[PDB]
């Protein structure tokens, strides 16, 4: 309505790309045969601007919506452990 409030809203919104929380997403597609291609989507966020939160969504090659696993992690050590477990599970699946 009034010019001043809209002007201030515009000027403040102009800085969203700097003030807003950073985010990142990484999609990994693994080449598998038998039309069974699992997906690995890892999104990294910093909700409190300092802590790292890693959300992992691993979809096995069974259905487009049957998410095999969907977990969250705050410790990189557990991230590496679960990554190693997922790699071992994929190797076993490729061996069967």
């Amino acid at each position: 309505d009034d010019e001043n409030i809209t002007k201030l809203n515009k000027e403040i919104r102009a800085f969203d790309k700097l003030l807003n929380i950073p985010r990142r997403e990484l999609k990994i597609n693994l080449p598998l045969t038998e039309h069974k291609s699992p997906n690995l989507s890892l999104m990294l966020e910093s909700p409190n601007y300092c802590n790292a939160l890693i959300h992992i969504k691993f979809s096995a090659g069974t259905e487009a919506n049957a998410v095999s696993f969907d977990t969250t992690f705050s410790d990189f050590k557990e991230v590496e452990d679960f990554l190693h477990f997922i790699v071992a599970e994929y190797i076993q699946q490729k061996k069967v």
Partner: protein, 253 residues
């Protein structure tokens, strides 16, 4: 429910622009545009309310106010989109005609509000009034409409009017309003506040029992009035003019 402490006044439009400069010099804040639309409803005369305890006068019938905000796209004609939306547009609102007509308001059909006559006695320096308020958020059903709702309660439409003006926010919760009022009927639209602006400075108190706060509020209002001495005279209106009971009919405008 609040205790509203208020002071009133009026000004001629000639000084309007010079008044707006001075306010900006005191508050430090600019004006903000606003508008509103109020509809007054009264108890249905077809229904005989024998429940009014005539031998004791436990209660008397009163009038209900329903208010709503209306977008400026209904108030700006084809000649006015070029100008930006700010306080200067009020300078063109001097004619009794207005884009919003009876049919549009009929098509519209919120905040529900009831009040009482101010406190008696001649030792009161500011108009103290008691207000009971509630809010209507939404509705549903086969006849979801404000008119049907108020007829369900037992009330009928009486009249309506449109306010357009500017607002100033000062310290301590003091609000100062400059208004122009347009009464609306099927016969047409008439500006009651012809060739002038109605000025109203007020504060709200949440609890009537707290008296330190009320004393502080009165101190702030009288200090504000004593600041504007020589420019505009702010006065306590007539106690019998702000009475909105059905038995006796008059309307401060």
């Amino acid at each position: 429910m609040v205790q509203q402490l208020s002071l009133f006044g009026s000004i001629g439009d000639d000084g309007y622009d010079l008044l707006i400069s001075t306010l900006t010099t005191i508050s430090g804040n600019p004006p903000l545009l606003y508008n509103s639309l109020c509809t007054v409803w009264k108890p249905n005369p077809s229904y005989d309310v024998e429940n009014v305890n005539s031998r004791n006068q436990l209660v008397e019938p009163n009038r209900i106010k329903l208010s709503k905000e209306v977008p400026f796209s209904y108030l700006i004609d084809e000649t006015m989109m070029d100008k930006p939306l700010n306080f200067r547009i009020l300078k063109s609102f001097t004619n009794d005609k207005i884009p919003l007509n009876y049919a549009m308001t009929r098509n519209i059909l919120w905040s529900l509000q009831i009040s009482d006559i101010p406190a008696a006695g001649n030792n009161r320096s500011v108009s103290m009034q008691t207000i009971a308020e509630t809010i209507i958020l939404s509705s549903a059903g086969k006849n979801s409409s404000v008119s049907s709702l108020m007829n369900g309660l037992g009330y009928v439409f009486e009249f309506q009017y449109l306010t357009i003006g500017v607002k100033f926010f000062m310290k301590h919760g003091l609000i100062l309003e400059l208004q122009k009022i347009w009464q609306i009927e099927e016969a047409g639209n008439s500006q009651i506040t012809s060739g002038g602006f109605l000025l109203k400075a007020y504060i709200n108190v949440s609890r009537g029992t707290d008296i330190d706060r009320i004393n502080y509020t009165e101190t702030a209002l009288m200090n504000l009035k004593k600041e504007l001495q020589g420019y505009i005279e702010l006065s306590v209106p007539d106690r019998q003019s702000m009475d909105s009971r059905v038995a006796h009919g008059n309307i401060l405008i």
